[PDB]
Design a protein around this ligand. Structure first.
Ligand code: 6KK
Ligand code: CL
Ligand code: CL
Ligand code: NA
Lengths: 99, 99
């Protein structure tokens, strides 16, 4: 699809068996999902943006479905009010910025 | 241009006669730049990032070139980890997300 930026670029994703809405975010290096359980081992990480840093759990090799396209990669889980699909998974679905 | 997301989508901007590097950020509603001097009056704005809320200076109707495309719009000045070009100016340069 071609997604305009007049509004936030929100799509439906499926992760951990759950359907969620998420933001396609080219400024996020990594994908960050609101608090949820995922299977497998994890390790702590700090990520920073406007306002400073938050602590998240890093899960590797997690599959997501993003607007109908399957991808696999690292997912960070932590206290965010909005699910963020970051570059590590945007690349896998062939997303590009065009102008 | 068509910009893939394997690396950060960094571009050169021109604002205040000066060249700076900025990140094209579809998850930002607003454009936020690090401390610099801009002409005219400013207004207060609170914006919320991943780490919490910060006060910024809002300057309206600022001329800015982004990857060679001309925009005239609102620029927020404050402590950001990187200069970010948000949707208010991405729309002016005709950017879309495609996959
Ligand atoms: C290492 O991997 C990551 C490291 C950092 C982030 S980040 O969420 O902090 N951020 C990085 C960027 C600031 C360099 C991504 C941004 O797109 C962030 C994305 C957010 C995702 C989620 C919803 C909302 C607030 C917050 C939580 C940040 C936008 N947007 C943002 O801060 O926008 C501000 C400027 O415009 C305004 O409009 C939106 C908030 C404000 C994500 C993954
Ligand atoms: Cl990854
Ligand atoms: Cl590619
Ligand atoms: Na894992």
């Amino acid at each position: 699809p071609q997604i305009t930026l007049w509004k936030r670029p929100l799509v439906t994703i499926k992760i951990g068996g759950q359907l969620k809405e998420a933001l396609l975010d080219t400024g996020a290096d990594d994908t960050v999902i609101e608090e949820m359980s995922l299977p497998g081992r994890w390790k702590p990480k700090m990520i920073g943006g406007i306002g400073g840093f938050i602590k998240v759990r890093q899960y590797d090799q997690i599959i997501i479905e993003i607007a109908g396209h399957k991808a696999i990669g690292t997912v960070l889980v932590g206290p965010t009010p909005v699910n963020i699909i970051g570059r590590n998974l945007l690349t896998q679905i062939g997303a590009t910025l065009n102008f």
